[PDB]
Curated annotation (Swiss-Prot), chain B:
Changing residue 99 to A: Abolishes enzyme activity and ability to bind tRNA. GO terms for cellular component: cytoplasm. Pathway: tRNA modification; wybutosine-tRNA(Phe) biosynthesis. Its EC number is 1.14.11.42. This is tRNA wybutosine-synthesizing protein 5. 2-oxoglutarate binds at residues 97, 157, 166.
Length: 311, 302
C-alpha cells in the first residue's frame, strides 16, 4: 500500500447530478473526459490568445531551470503583457529574456489588486471568458476564484495543496499531475502548503526518507480534459507541452469558515489557524520544562491528538 | 531490544552526582553502605521492631480490579508476606502487598522517618541528593511472585533492595507509544510473554533488565517505566526526590505521580485547541490534527 502508484479514475459522459450527488461527496480526485467546454478548446491557439487576451500586463514566474525550487528560490518574479507571455511560453529558446534564453515561464493569474481581489477570469479576461463554459459542478454562491494557468513545457511546479475544491481544465496541451492523499502529509516534509521534495520521480531518500511511504495517484491531461481536486489534496503538475489551463476554485464549506484576507486559496480555515495559535501556546508553556520532560510530554500529546481527533 | 542495566561498584557520592546522574539513565549501584538494616531486617526482627501499627495492605495483578485493599497489623503483614498463609481475607494462597503511606493519605507523603522511626535508624539513605529535594521515602514489602503492573513516576527514584531478590525491567520514557499508556500505568500486565494479539506494539519496546540482590540500589531517573517482580520475599525501600525546582510540581500530589503543573496545563489548553478543530468536518479536522502532530514533533521532540 505505502509507496504505491495509482491511476486517477477517468470518467466520460458524467452528468451534473451524478457529479454533484455521487462523485463529488466521494472526496477523491477524478478526471472527466469529453465535457462541452465551449469552443475555447479549438480557438485558443497561441496567435489567438495573444490577439484576444493581449497586453493586459501580468505577474509572472521566470525560471532558468525546469525544476523550480522555493527552498532555494531559484526563480524570479517579473511582469509581462499577456500576449508576450503566451508567445514566450510556447517558445523553447528566447530572443529576448529576463535571465537566460532557455528560461521557462509560468503564469498563475491574479485579481486586479491581489490584496483584496481573488482572480476572476470573467472579471479580468472578459473576451476570453467568452470561449469557455465552466462546468456547472457547484452552487454559484460558493464560487471563489477562477485562474489562468499557462506554462512553458518542461516546467515543473512544486507539490502543494489548496483549501478550496478545484476543477482544473486543460484546454490546450498535455499536463501530468500526480496527487497525494491529504493523509499523506506526514510523508511530504511540508513547509506551509509546499513540500520540500522537489524531484518526486527520483527522490533523494537520504534527505527525505519518509517520502517513501507516499502513495501517489497519477494522471495526464489531454486538451479538453477536466480534473477535480478535493481540498487538501496535494498535487504536482508538470506541463509536458505548451498548454493553457483554467482552474476554478470553490467553497466546500460555509463561506463563514474561511479566512477573508485569503484571495489565493492557501490560507487555513480560521478554525484550523486559530487551533494552530492555541497549540503554539502549549508548545510554549511546556517549552521550558527541561528537554527530557518536554519530549516525554510532547509524545503524550501527539498520541492524544491521534486518538481524539484523527478519525 | 533486551538490554542489561549497567552494574557499578565503588561509585562515589560525587562521581554519581557529577558524571552519572546527569546521564539520565538507570543504573544499579552495588555495595553502598546502607547500614545494619541489610543485615538485621529479618522477618522475625522486622515483626518485632515494626510493631502492631495498622497498615494499608493490597491483596500477577490487574489495574480490571483483581486486587483488594485491606489493612493489617504490620508484624502479621510481614509474617504472612513471607508465607500459603493460613489466615487470609480472600484465599489460602492470598498474595500480600505493602506500600507505605503517610498519616493523612490525601494530605501527606509517605516518609520512613515519620512512620518507622526505630527501623529508620537502621538504614542510611545514600546522599545522592539535597534534603530540599527530598520528596518521599516508601516501605515496600511484597510477597514472592507478585507482579506489580508497569508504571512511571515523575520524581527521580532510588530503589534500595534491603532484603531478598527482586527483578525489574524498564523502558525508555520515549517508548511511551509502545506501552499503551492509561495515565501512568501501562496496559500489558504479563511482561514476559505478552499477548501481541491485543497489543501489537509492545514488541517494538526495548526492555532493559536487572536483578536486585540484597544491598543493591537501582537508580530510576524520572519518567522511566519499570516493572518489579519479587523473586524471593523481601523488603525494599525507595526514595523519591525532586529533579526540578520544587515549584514545577503538583502540590496536590502525595505520590510523585501527577504531571508537573506545566504538563497538566499544556494538555488542558491542548484539549481546547481540539475543541475548535473538532467543529470542522472530520476530514478537515483530521488533516489539521496531523499537521499539529507534525508541528509538535518538529518543535518539542528531542
Ligand atoms: Mg493549486
Amino acid at each position: 500500500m505505502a509507496g504505491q502508484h495509482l491511476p486517477v479514475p477517468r470518467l466520460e459522459g458524467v452528468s451534473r447530478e451524478q457529479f454533484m450527488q455521487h462523485l463529488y461527496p466521494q472526496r477523491k480526485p477524478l478526471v472527466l473526459e469529453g465535457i462541452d467546454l465551449g469552443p475555447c478548446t479549438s480557438k485558443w491557439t497561441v496567435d489567438y490568445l495573444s490577439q484576444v487576451g493581449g497586453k493586459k500586463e501580468v505577474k509572472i514566474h521566470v525560471a532558468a531551470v525546469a525544476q523550480m525550487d522555493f527552498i532555494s528560490k531559484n526563480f524570479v518574479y517579473r511582469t509581462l503583457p499577456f500576449d508576450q507571455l503566451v508567445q514566450r511560453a510556447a517558445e523553447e529558446k528566447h530572443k529576448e529574456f529576463f535571465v537566460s534564453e532557455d528560461e521557462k515561464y509560468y503564469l498563475r493569474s491574479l485579481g486586479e489588486d491581489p490584496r483584496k481581489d481573488v482572480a476572476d477570469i470573467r472579471k479580468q479576461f472578459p473576451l476570453l471568458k467568452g470561449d469557455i463554459k465552466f462546468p456547472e459542478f457547484f452552487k454559484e454562491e460558493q464560487f471563489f476564484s477562477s485562474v489562468f494557468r499557462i506554462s512553458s513545457p518542461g516546467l515543473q511546479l512544486w507539490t502543494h495543496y489548496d483549501v478550496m475544491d478545484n476543477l482544473l481544465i486543460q484546454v490546450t496541451g498535455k499536463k501530468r499531475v500526480v496527487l497525494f492523499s491529504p493523509r499523506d502529509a506526514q510523508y511530504l516534509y511540508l513547509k506551509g502548503t509546499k513540500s520540500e521534495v522537489l524531484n518526486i520521480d527520483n527522490p533523494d531518500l537520504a534527505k527525505y526518507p519518509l517520502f517513501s511511504k507516499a502513495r501517489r495517484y497519477e494522471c495526464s491531461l489531454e486538451a479538453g480534459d477536466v480534473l477535480f481536486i478535493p481540498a487538501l489534496w496535494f498535487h504536482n503538475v508538470i506541463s509536458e507541452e505548451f498548454g493553457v489551463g483554467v482552474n476554478i476554485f470553490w467553497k466546500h464549506l460555509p463561506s463563514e469558515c474561511y479566512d477573508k484576507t485569503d484571495t489565493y486559496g492557501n490560507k487555513d480555515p480560521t478554525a484550523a489557524s486559530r487551533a494552530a495559535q492555541i497549540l503554539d501556546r502549549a508548545l510554549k508553556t511546556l517549552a521550558e520544562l527541561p528537554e527530557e520532560y518536554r519530549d516525554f510530554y510532547a509524545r503524550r500529546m501527539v498520541l492524544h491528538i491521534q486518538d481524539k481527533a484523527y478519525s
